[PDB]
C-alpha cells in the first residue's frame, strides 16, 4: 500500500463546458512529481452520475469529447504512479431525475442528503432496488475495460429506508416497518447483499482487485463491515466536519486489526468541493506525520478543475508534506504498535453515548484526549480483540457489565490485567450493583451534581490540595477493602429555585460524601463520568485524576516517559524484521480561526526532549534520528534506554536498534 | 494604579450558615502574600443584596455575626494592600422579592437576567425608580464608614426598560414607548442621571474617591460613558464568555485615551461563580503578560468561600503569575504605545455588524486577529481620536462615508495619511459611489458570491499564483488611475437549484471580473468584506492579502519587523521619562478543550527571535532583557536597531535605551 496518495475529486456539473480541454499528459505528470505523489484515485463516475470515459453502461459527461479516465491512467502509469478508480454508488444525480422511485425515503417520505429537487445537492439511491443491478453492470464495465489499481465505492453503508420497494419487501418478509429494529436489520442485509454482489462481480473478472466501501467512518466493534474491504481508507478531514480526535480514535483501532489503512485529509481549508481553498503547508506536514506515527499511509483530497489542468499551488502544497513522507516511509512499513493500555471505546462496546463531533462520541473523545496529552501508549480494542497483551484496560464512564462484556473482563482480571473504570463502568445493566472487585459497594446515583473531588495523595493536582468541581454524573460509593486516593465533598445544595449561591453551583459544604477514587489489587475506580466531563467542560483536574490513576496502575512497567509537553503526540512502533523500535515524537497545536475551524500555520521547534523507554529486549545496539541518520548519545541497561532529542520540528523519528 | 489586583467575589445565599466563621487576619494576609497581591476589591453588598458589615441602610447577611468588610480592610491595610469596595447596583435579590415593581421589564413584561422567580438567578432593578435613592443612601453609608480605596459599582449601563414607572414617565415627557429610539434615549438619560448622582454623593464625602461603573464592556466611540469613571476595569474572561479577541480590542482602544485601566480575568477554568474551578498557572502567566504589554494593570477574579477561608490552591495559582508581574512593573508604568496603524473599528464608527462573540463584532475580530498575527503596531481609534500621528488608517468592510466620518478621513488623506479600505468602506451611504480617491469606480454589489481573487504580485500568497476563494460580499469595480495588485475571477455560476457543481461553490470560470485589489497614491482597496470573512471562514489568503497591502503602504517606514511566528504577540511601548523603549514579545497558543473553551497548559520556549526596530531617536545607547538585566548584542545606525532574543518563554521584555 503506497504512502503518498491523492484522492482526485471530479464532481462536475453537466452545465460546465469543455471538460478536460486543458488536460495534458505533461501537466498531469509534472504536478504528480511536484507533489511527490505515488498513487492518485481518479474518477470513472461522479456524484452528478457522469462517466469520464466513453461508457456503454453509463452516459459520458455531455461536454467531455475524449477518454479522460484512460488518459489519466496512462499518464500516471508511465511515471510509476498507481491509479485506483472512484465510482459514486449512493449518488447518481442525472439518474435521480429519471428514477426517483429508486431513491431512499425516511418515515416522513424525505430524500437525503437534500429533501427536494428545488434545492441544490444530491439524492441518495436505495440499494434494495434495481439500481443495484445498474451499479454492478457499471462496476463490471470499468473493471473490464481499464487497467486500474483498485476500486473506491462512495456513499455506501447500512441505512434505514422506508421507500416503496423497502416497505413492500418488509411486509412480504413479515417485518414491521413501524418497528425501528426491523428496518435497521433490513438495512444490514441490504448493505451486505450489495458488498457480496460487488466482490463476486469483480472476482469473476480480476480476482483480488482492491475494493474500499466508503461510509465516511470505520464503525468500531463491526468486524463484518471492516472485512468487506481489502484495506481501510479513514476519511478524516479535521477542518471539514470530522475534528482532530476522529483520526487517532480510528487509526489506534485499525492498526492492531492487521488491515493496511490510510488517513485521508484534504488540501482544502474546509471540506470537499472547496475550489480555491488551501491549507498552510505546516498543516499537511503535521497531519501526514501523525498518519505515519500511527501505522497509516497518507491520502490528500483535491478536486481537479473541470478543464482538466492540475493546480500548481495545490501540488506545491502536497509536495511540501509528501517530500518528507518519501524520506521516512522506510521506518513505517510493517510496523506494529507497542501499547501499555487497551481503551474499550463506548462505541466498540455497543453502548449509547452523546455525540461530540460528526462521527465521535463525548466519552471516547474525552479518553483519547487524555491518552494523547498524557503520552500513554495505547490501542483501541473491541470485544473481538485479544486483551491479554495489555497491562491496563480502560472502561470509560458507561461500560455496564452486560452478558457480551463481563466474562471477557473477568478473564482479563483473572490473568493479571488491571482496569481503570469510571462512572457507570462495572455496574450491572440495572445499575444497582458494582460487578468488578474494585474495593467498594455502589450506594446509587450521587444526589448532588455538580459536586467536588479532593485528592488525598500528593502529586495528583499541579496546585495541590483543594476541592475540585466535578460536573459529570456521579455514583455515591462506600469503601470496603479498597484504599481511598481522594474523596467526594457535597455542595451546600443543588442550584434550584429559591436555593442558589452566586452564578453557578453552590460552594463545597466541606462535608465528606464518601470516596471518589478507590484503588484495589485489580485496579482503580473514579466515581464520576470524568471522560464525558473532559470532552464537555475540559477541567484540567479530570486529566490529572485519570493520568495519576493510570501511572499508578502501570507503576515501574510503564514503557515510555517523556518531557514532550501536553499538545505533543508520541507512539512507539516495532519493525520486527529490522530489529528496531521507532519512537515517533510530534508537536503541533491547532488554533481556532474563523468561527470554529482549528488550523495549523506555525510549527514551533522543541529542544532537549527527553525519553525513557522500557523495551522487552536484552541489549540496545544504538539510537539515531531518521531520516537524518544522526547518532545521538544514550544510556542503556538491558531493554531500559534514555536519550535526549536535541531538536524536534513537527515530527522526529528516533530509531532504537536492539539484539533480542 | 496597582498592577497585581484580585476581584474577590462574595455572592452568598442567605441559606448558607456560619458566614466568615473560618475568616482570620492571619489566613487573609498569608494568602495575599502567597498571591503577591497588592490590591483586593472586597464586598460591601453582593447580588443576593446582603451587606457584609453591620449596615443601617441595608440588612447584613442573616448568618454573618461580625463586620467582615471592616476585618478585610484592616487585615489588608496592615500589610500595605489597597482594598477597593464592591457594591452590586443592578442586583439586590432579597429586595427584588419585596419590590418587584422596581425591576426592569422588556416590551413583553419579561425580567432579566432570569424571566421568573420560579427559576434560579438574579432580577435587575430599573434605576429610573426610587431604587436609585436607596442605592445612593447605601453607597453614602459605605463611603462614610469604611476606609476603602475606591468603589466598584456592578450591573450598570444604558438599558431599554418598559417597567410601569418608565412607561408613565415616557408618556408624560411626550416620548413614544412603541418607538425603540425614544426608549434607547430615555435609557441614556436614566444611566447618566445615576452616574451624576453617584459622583455628587461621593464628592460630598470623600472628593476624588475612585469609582468604576461595570457594564462588562467599554463601548467604543462613547467618551461620555468612559468619562463617568476615574479609571477603566476591562472585565474580559477569555474562557468565561468574552473570547481572546475582546481584551486586545479594548486595551488598544483604552491606552491612547489616557485612562489608567486594568485587564480583569478569572482564576476559574470558566466564568464567575466556578467554585472548585482552576486554570493552569501558564494561562495566567500569559494573560497578565498580555495586559502589561498593552499598557494595562492586572486583576484576577476569585470567589471567597462563604466560611471566609481564602483558598491556598487559588493564591498558589495567582502567585505564579503575580511574582513575575512584580519583577516587570518598573518597565510598564507611564508607558505610551508606538503604532504605525490606526484601526477605526466598526463599533467606534457607530455602524451595524454581525456579533462574533458576547461583546465583539466579526469585522472588528477579523481586523484585530490579522494585526496581532501580522505583528503590525496599532491602536484602535474613534471619531474623537487624533489620527494625524498614524501613517495608515484601516477602514474595515463597512465604514460608509457618512457626515460624521468623511471630513475626518479627507483631512487625514490631505495631511499625507494612507488608508487600507475593504468592501463597503469609502462608499457613500446610498452605496452607489466610492468617495475616496483609491483609483477605481464602483460598479455595484458583485453578482457572484463566493468568487475568487488572483494575486498579480509576487510575495503575497505563500503558495504563489492561484485563484483563491473569497466568501465575503464583494464590490465589482473598474480601474481608472489605480494600479491592479490582483484580480477578481467569476465562478461558472452561483450554487442554486438546477445549477450546482460538487459539494459547495462552482470552480473558477477563469474569466477576469475586474480588479480585486487596487493601489493609489493615498492607499489600497480590497473589493471584498475580507475582515468578516477571516472571522467566519478563516482562510489564510485573507490575512496574506491584508498584511501585503499594509506592508506595501508602510514600506520603509515600518517601525517593527520580527520572526516572532503567527500565534505570537508584540508591542513597542515608550517610557519617555526613562529614555527607553520596551519591545514586548509573547508566545502562547490557546487550544480548544471541552466543547469550545480555549485554554493554555503548555508554554513552549522560542529561540533566536529576531527584531528590527526603527525608533524616532538619534543614538541607541544599549539593549537588554528585563527583568534579567542581561545585555544582548545589537547593531544600531541612528534610531534603526536589530537584535536577537536568545530565548523567549511566555513573555520577554527587551529594553532599548536611547539619547534623543
Ligand atoms: Zn429503500
Ligand atoms: Zn424602568
PDB file of N, CA, C and O in Angstrom, chain B residues 273-303:
ATOM      1  N   UNK B 273     -18.268  32.476  39.597  1.00  0.00           N
ATOM      2  CA  UNK B 273     -19.092  31.546  40.380  1.00  0.00           C
ATOM      3  C   UNK B 273     -18.591  30.127  40.285  1.00  0.00           C
ATOM      4  O   UNK B 273     -19.261  29.271  40.866  1.00  0.00           O
ATOM      5  N   UNK B 274     -17.459  29.881  39.608  1.00  0.00           N
ATOM      6  CA  UNK B 274     -16.977  28.498  39.387  1.00  0.00           C
ATOM      7  C   UNK B 274     -16.142  28.069  40.584  1.00  0.00           C
ATOM      8  O   UNK B 274     -14.946  27.863  40.441  1.00  0.00           O
ATOM      9  N   UNK B 275     -16.800  27.853  41.706  1.00  0.00           N
ATOM     10  CA  UNK B 275     -16.218  27.207  42.895  1.00  0.00           C
ATOM     11  C   UNK B 275     -15.572  25.899  42.443  1.00  0.00           C
ATOM     12  O   UNK B 275     -16.214  25.150  41.707  1.00  0.00           O
ATOM     13  N   UNK B 276     -14.323  25.666  42.853  1.00  0.00           N
ATOM     14  CA  UNK B 276     -13.561  24.437  42.578  1.00  0.00           C
ATOM     15  C   UNK B 276     -12.964  24.438  41.185  1.00  0.00           C
ATOM     16  O   UNK B 276     -12.501  23.376  40.752  1.00  0.00           O
ATOM     17  N   UNK B 277     -13.042  25.568  40.476  1.00  0.00           N
ATOM     18  CA  UNK B 277     -12.543  25.714  39.092  1.00  0.00           C
ATOM     19  C   UNK B 277     -11.182  26.373  39.091  1.00  0.00           C
ATOM     20  O   UNK B 277     -11.034  27.402  39.782  1.00  0.00           O
ATOM     21  N   UNK B 278     -10.214  25.815  38.357  1.00  0.00           N
ATOM     22  CA  UNK B 278      -8.812  26.285  38.355  1.00  0.00           C
ATOM     23  C   UNK B 278      -8.196  26.181  36.959  1.00  0.00           C
ATOM     24  O   UNK B 278      -8.123  25.092  36.383  1.00  0.00           O
ATOM     25  N   UNK B 279      -7.692  27.304  36.462  1.00  0.00           N
ATOM     26  CA  UNK B 279      -6.800  27.345  35.286  1.00  0.00           C
ATOM     27  C   UNK B 279      -5.450  26.743  35.670  1.00  0.00           C
ATOM     28  O   UNK B 279      -5.148  26.590  36.869  1.00  0.00           O
ATOM     29  N   UNK B 280      -4.658  26.434  34.662  1.00  0.00           N
ATOM     30  CA  UNK B 280      -3.235  26.103  34.836  1.00  0.00           C
ATOM     31  C   UNK B 280      -2.482  27.407  34.991  1.00  0.00           C
ATOM     32  O   UNK B 280      -2.787  28.366  34.288  1.00  0.00           O
ATOM     33  N   UNK B 281      -1.450  27.456  35.862  1.00  0.00           N
ATOM     34  CA  UNK B 281      -0.623  28.649  36.014  1.00  0.00           C
ATOM     35  C   UNK B 281      -0.213  29.329  34.713  1.00  0.00           C
ATOM     36  O   UNK B 281      -0.280  30.563  34.661  1.00  0.00           O
ATOM     37  N   UNK B 282       0.180  28.548  33.706  1.00  0.00           N
ATOM     38  CA  UNK B 282       0.686  29.101  32.425  1.00  0.00           C
ATOM     39  C   UNK B 282      -0.366  29.993  31.767  1.00  0.00           C
ATOM     40  O   UNK B 282       0.044  30.889  31.032  1.00  0.00           O
ATOM     41  N   UNK B 283      -1.664  29.765  32.009  1.00  0.00           N
ATOM     42  CA  UNK B 283      -2.738  30.576  31.401  1.00  0.00           C
ATOM     43  C   UNK B 283      -2.660  31.980  31.997  1.00  0.00           C
ATOM     44  O   UNK B 283      -2.732  32.957  31.233  1.00  0.00           O
ATOM     45  N   UNK B 284      -2.475  32.080  33.315  1.00  0.00           N
ATOM     46  CA  UNK B 284      -2.456  33.407  33.998  1.00  0.00           C
ATOM     47  C   UNK B 284      -1.114  34.105  33.761  1.00  0.00           C
ATOM     48  O   UNK B 284      -1.129  35.350  33.619  1.00  0.00           O
ATOM     49  N   UNK B 285      -0.033  33.350  33.591  1.00  0.00           N
ATOM     50  CA  UNK B 285       1.293  33.928  33.266  1.00  0.00           C
ATOM     51  C   UNK B 285       1.155  34.684  31.949  1.00  0.00           C
ATOM     52  O   UNK B 285       1.507  35.860  31.910  1.00  0.00           O
ATOM     53  N   UNK B 286       0.599  34.052  30.924  1.00  0.00           N
ATOM     54  CA  UNK B 286       0.398  34.681  29.598  1.00  0.00           C
ATOM     55  C   UNK B 286      -0.594  35.847  29.660  1.00  0.00           C
ATOM     56  O   UNK B 286      -0.343  36.884  29.004  1.00  0.00           O
ATOM     57  N   UNK B 287      -1.738  35.656  30.322  1.00  0.00           N
ATOM     58  CA  UNK B 287      -2.834  36.659  30.321  1.00  0.00           C
ATOM     59  C   UNK B 287      -2.363  37.937  31.035  1.00  0.00           C
ATOM     60  O   UNK B 287      -2.652  39.017  30.543  1.00  0.00           O
ATOM     61  N   UNK B 288      -1.629  37.825  32.137  1.00  0.00           N
ATOM     62  CA  UNK B 288      -1.074  39.002  32.861  1.00  0.00           C
ATOM     63  C   UNK B 288      -0.027  39.670  31.969  1.00  0.00           C
ATOM     64  O   UNK B 288      -0.142  40.881  31.764  1.00  0.00           O
ATOM     65  N   UNK B 289       0.847  38.898  31.326  1.00  0.00           N
ATOM     66  CA  UNK B 289       1.896  39.426  30.420  1.00  0.00           C
ATOM     67  C   UNK B 289       1.260  40.270  29.317  1.00  0.00           C
ATOM     68  O   UNK B 289       1.791  41.321  28.953  1.00  0.00           O
ATOM     69  N   UNK B 290       0.141  39.812  28.789  1.00  0.00           N
ATOM     70  CA  UNK B 290      -0.539  40.461  27.647  1.00  0.00           C
ATOM     71  C   UNK B 290      -1.163  41.789  28.113  1.00  0.00           C
ATOM     72  O   UNK B 290      -1.191  42.779  27.327  1.00  0.00           O
ATOM     73  N   UNK B 291      -1.640  41.841  29.353  1.00  0.00           N
ATOM     74  CA  UNK B 291      -2.072  43.113  29.998  1.00  0.00           C
ATOM     75  C   UNK B 291      -0.868  44.065  30.072  1.00  0.00           C
ATOM     76  O   UNK B 291      -0.945  45.130  29.436  1.00  0.00           O
ATOM     77  N   UNK B 292       0.247  43.644  30.676  1.00  0.00           N
ATOM     78  CA  UNK B 292       1.458  44.509  30.810  1.00  0.00           C
ATOM     79  C   UNK B 292       1.835  45.055  29.432  1.00  0.00           C
ATOM     80  O   UNK B 292       2.044  46.250  29.331  1.00  0.00           O
ATOM     81  N   UNK B 293       1.923  44.200  28.414  1.00  0.00           N
ATOM     82  CA  UNK B 293       2.443  44.586  27.091  1.00  0.00           C
ATOM     83  C   UNK B 293       1.524  45.630  26.467  1.00  0.00           C
ATOM     84  O   UNK B 293       1.997  46.370  25.629  1.00  0.00           O
ATOM     85  N   UNK B 294       0.247  45.668  26.845  1.00  0.00           N
ATOM     86  CA  UNK B 294      -0.753  46.560  26.198  1.00  0.00           C
ATOM     87  C   UNK B 294      -0.997  47.803  27.056  1.00  0.00           C
ATOM     88  O   UNK B 294      -1.844  48.619  26.668  1.00  0.00           O
ATOM     89  N   UNK B 295      -0.286  47.959  28.167  1.00  0.00           N
ATOM     90  CA  UNK B 295      -0.309  49.210  28.945  1.00  0.00           C
ATOM     91  C   UNK B 295      -1.306  49.137  30.075  1.00  0.00           C
ATOM     92  O   UNK B 295      -1.679  50.192  30.601  1.00  0.00           O
ATOM     93  N   UNK B 296      -1.679  47.928  30.487  1.00  0.00           N
ATOM     94  CA  UNK B 296      -2.750  47.705  31.473  1.00  0.00           C
ATOM     95  C   UNK B 296      -2.151  47.117  32.749  1.00  0.00           C
ATOM     96  O   UNK B 296      -1.119  46.454  32.677  1.00  0.00           O
ATOM     97  N   UNK B 297      -2.794  47.398  33.874  1.00  0.00           N
ATOM     98  CA  UNK B 297      -2.615  46.664  35.147  1.00  0.00           C
ATOM     99  C   UNK B 297      -3.400  45.349  35.056  1.00  0.00           C
ATOM    100  O   UNK B 297      -4.075  45.143  34.044  1.00  0.00           O
ATOM    101  N   UNK B 298      -3.290  44.491  36.066  1.00  0.00           N
ATOM    102  CA  UNK B 298      -3.929  43.151  36.110  1.00  0.00           C
ATOM    103  C   UNK B 298      -4.935  43.053  37.261  1.00  0.00           C
ATOM    104  O   UNK B 298      -4.670  43.592  38.332  1.00  0.00           O
ATOM    105  N   UNK B 299      -6.079  42.416  37.009  1.00  0.00           N
ATOM    106  CA  UNK B 299      -6.975  41.883  38.061  1.00  0.00           C
ATOM    107  C   UNK B 299      -7.244  40.404  37.752  1.00  0.00           C
ATOM    108  O   UNK B 299      -7.400  40.041  36.574  1.00  0.00           O
ATOM    109  N   UNK B 300      -7.274  39.568  38.781  1.00  0.00           N
ATOM    110  CA  UNK B 300      -7.694  38.146  38.677  1.00  0.00           C
ATOM    111  C   UNK B 300      -8.885  37.954  39.611  1.00  0.00           C
ATOM    112  O   UNK B 300      -8.759  38.232  40.817  1.00  0.00           O
ATOM    113  N   UNK B 301     -10.001  37.520  39.040  1.00  0.00           N
ATOM    114  CA  UNK B 301     -11.232  37.225  39.777  1.00  0.00           C
ATOM    115  C   UNK B 301     -11.055  35.996  40.645  1.00  0.00           C
ATOM    116  O   UNK B 301     -10.394  35.047  40.206  1.00  0.00           O
ATOM    117  N   UNK B 302     -11.688  35.985  41.815  1.00  0.00           N
ATOM    118  CA  UNK B 302     -11.761  34.800  42.710  1.00  0.00           C
ATOM    119  C   UNK B 302     -13.140  34.882  43.345  1.00  0.00           C
ATOM    120  O   UNK B 302     -13.805  35.902  43.112  1.00  0.00           O
ATOM    121  N   UNK B 303     -13.617  33.830  44.008  1.00  0.00           N
ATOM    122  CA  UNK B 303     -14.773  33.973  44.927  1.00  0.00           C
ATOM    123  C   UNK B 303     -14.367  33.360  46.260  1.00  0.00           C
ATOM    124  O   UNK B 303     -13.926  32.241  46.273  1.00  0.00           O
TER     125      UNK B 303
END
